[PDB]
């Protein structure tokens, strides 16, 4: 019929993006970074250990004050820790026992969870009548929620398992926009430091870059070949890394529309669970499934240090906003914090 | 430093309240079994317990039958969560071979559960449901298992096979072929760390939850004996 012609012109358009990408692929950093003095050996140590959970820890998030890290586990708890003094501040229970992510607002006022009950429960910290309970239960998805991030105290953009990232409005209680366009399940998303736009990796090896102001898709990067577990932005806004399940990380550019590097090593065989940059962005710290979270060099593409620790896989790896410490949520109810 | 002193004392008092509550509910998180209940589709999982979670208790031990009937059908991401679960109840539809041929799909789904990296240590209860629709399509033959399976014509009814009274031996041959077909996948790959406990669903639930309870007791006892290096 007439429907057959759309596929060949999609391939032709992809060929235009392909050879335009190879047009701007005239060089590589792998020759540029050779003149750069490498960081060499980097060794870090577990500073505090936060043994309060019961089941595996699925996701943590530092506050922007870099003192309080919330963490989220399958026991039904959302324990608001304290990096300086190992003191649980609130053990807020949860209805859905199967939490899959947590979130800390930049103003330190709300935290938010959300898992297999499809509902991104936003928890309130500033109830002065004693304890702390849920304010709004955002419920507009069909599939599960995999990672949610706060923009400010009024709107939260969350990923989902039913292929659609959404921008929620907390006070109203419905989706403002809907970031449709992904094909498979969508695992992680990270906001740019200017908070106007965000990337969102998924389970079709594609890291779509969106724009929350217009509410559309802008750029779709494909350099991976398995489902992308986690991504994170560069602190300047012109780059971001993608750790997928083919045991490699890849640095990209939002201004070249391509990959820039492949952080693949041969001895690692199982894929990245979480990945986040350092403060300056020189150190790309990846978190793996063979129980050790490597500390890559983000420009020389070599392991500048392998961390010790857990006896299960790591699950999340958040770096402080001032870069003072690094925490590693893992699947054995533990949170080693690393300077 | 007295402001830091009452700060430290207040924060340690909050620590004491939190740690006491965490002990008081760790004492019940260690006591409630969780049971992920998944199936293919058109199976009849609601006759077991009676948006998805449900819970019950028999003989002073608790269960949390976490159904997942609201999610998608692309299971490879949200089933990494259920490895802390004790016994993944896998109710199949044994009589969905006339139309999709859901038996081969259920076999491939079970093999994909068994060979996962994170679902290694979790055993599987197996419920060959749709027992009632099984018996008629093998005596009349509106869809043949031997059409969808080569080794059905050259299969022997097993010697240790108990019969239910008032039942044809060909129906027992069919259901025991399905049970040994699942057990072939269950014993071909790794079976030191996890097991399969096949069953046949009856019309009442008072024996069904008893079968679930005795089999979860078996999984706990094999876990403790595996910890002490006995078996």
């Amino acid at each position, epitope marked *: 019929s007439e429907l057959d012609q759309l596929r060949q012109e999609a391939e032709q358009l992809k060929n235009q993006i392909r050879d335009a990408r190879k047009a701007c692929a005239d060089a590589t950093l792998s020759q540029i970074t050779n003149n750069i003095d490498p960081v060499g050996r980097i060794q870090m140590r577990t500073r505090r250990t936060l043994r309060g959970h019961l089941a595996k820890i699925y996701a943590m998030h530092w506050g922007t004050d870099s003192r309080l890290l919330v963490s989220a586990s399958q026991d039904g708890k959302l324990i608001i820790w304290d990096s300086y003094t190992t003191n649980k501040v609130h053990a807020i229970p949860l209805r859905s026992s199967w939490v899959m992510t947590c979130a800390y607002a930049p103003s330190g006022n709300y935290v938010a969870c959300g898992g297999l009950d499809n509902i991104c429960s936003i928890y309130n910290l500033k109830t002065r009548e004693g304890n702390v309970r849920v304010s709004r239960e955002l419920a507009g998805h069909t599939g599960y929620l995999s990672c949610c991030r706060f923009l400010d105290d009024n709107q939260i953009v969350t990923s989902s398992g039913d292929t659609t990232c959404a921008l929620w409005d907390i006070e109203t209680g419905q989706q403002t926009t809907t970031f449709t366009g992904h094909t*498979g399940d969508v695992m992680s998303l990270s906001l740019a430091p200017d908070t106007r736009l965000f990337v969102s990796g998924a389970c079709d090896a594609s890291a779509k870059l969106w724009d929350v102001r217009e509410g559309m898709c802008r750029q779709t990067f494909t350099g991976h*070949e398995s*489902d992308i577990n986690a991504i994170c932005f560069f602190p300047n806004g012109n780059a971001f890394a993608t750790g997928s399940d083919d045991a490699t990380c890849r640095l990209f550019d939002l201004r070249a529309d391509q990959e820039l590097m492949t952080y693949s090593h041969d001895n690692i065989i199982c894929g990245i669970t979480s990945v986040s940059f350092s403060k300056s962005g020189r150190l790309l710290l990846a978190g793996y499934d063979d129980f050790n979270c490597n500390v890559w060099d983000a420009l020389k593409a070599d392991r500048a240090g392998v961390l010790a620790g857990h006896d299960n896989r790591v699950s999340c790896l958040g770096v402080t906003d001032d870069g003072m410490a690094v925490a590693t949520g893992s699947w054995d109810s533990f949170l080693k914090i690393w300077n | 430093t007295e402001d830091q002193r009452n700060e430290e004392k207040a924060q340690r008092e909050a620590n004491k309240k939190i740690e006491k509550q965490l002990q008081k509910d760790k004492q019940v998180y260690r006591a409630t079994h969780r049971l992920l209940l998944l199936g293919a589709g058109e199976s009849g999982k609601n006759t077991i317990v009676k948006i998805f979670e449900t819970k019950f208790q028999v003989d002073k031990v608790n269960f949390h039958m976490f159904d997942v009937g609201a999610q998608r*059908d692309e299971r490879r991401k949200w089933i990494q969560c259920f490895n802390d679960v004790t016994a993944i109840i896998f109710v199949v539809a044994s009589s969905s071979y006339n139309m*999709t041929n859901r038996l*081969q799909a259920a076999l491939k*789904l079970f093999d*994909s559960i068994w060979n996962n990296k994170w679902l290694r240590d979790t055993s599987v209860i197996l419920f060959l449901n749709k027992q009632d629709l099984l018996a008629e399509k093998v005596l009349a033959g509106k869809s043949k298992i031997e059409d969808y399976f080569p080794e059905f014509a050259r299969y022997t009814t097993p010697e240790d096979a108990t019969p239910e009274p008032g039942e044809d031996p060909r129906v027992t041959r069919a259901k025991y072929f399905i049970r040994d077909e699942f057990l072939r996948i269950s014993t071909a790959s790794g079976d030191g760390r996890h097991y399969c406990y096949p069953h046949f669903t009856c019309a009442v639930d008072t024996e069904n939850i008893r079968r679930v309870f005795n089999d979860c007791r078996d999984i706990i006892q094999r876990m403790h004996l595996r910890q002490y290096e006995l078996l």
Partner: nanobody
Amino acid sequence: QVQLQESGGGLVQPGGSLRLSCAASGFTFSNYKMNWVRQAPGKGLEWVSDISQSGASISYTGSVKGRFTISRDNAKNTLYLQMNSLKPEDTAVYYCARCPAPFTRDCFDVTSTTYAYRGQGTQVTVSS
């Protein structure tokens, strides 16, 4: 970037012999356990074949056991499913899928639409 072509195919006589060849491009083909999934027009998908990484572990659907054969070419990134002695009840479109994780023994790709790593297929039909 994954791209799965499904070369060959067409319309066969009942009893013919067709070699369906899956051309792949975008990844290390030697790592990922492939398969070959079909869907008859009118019902859902059903999984027909697989193969292991090296080529050792091979299964089939029991209705198509022995009548079809399956082989992979690691040096050419190509997957051949050669059919023999066809039947009227095997009219379907044949998607060359791929299990999604490298260096694993299990996969969840028999399921419904919007699976990622699964080519557009090749509609095959037997004669009257």
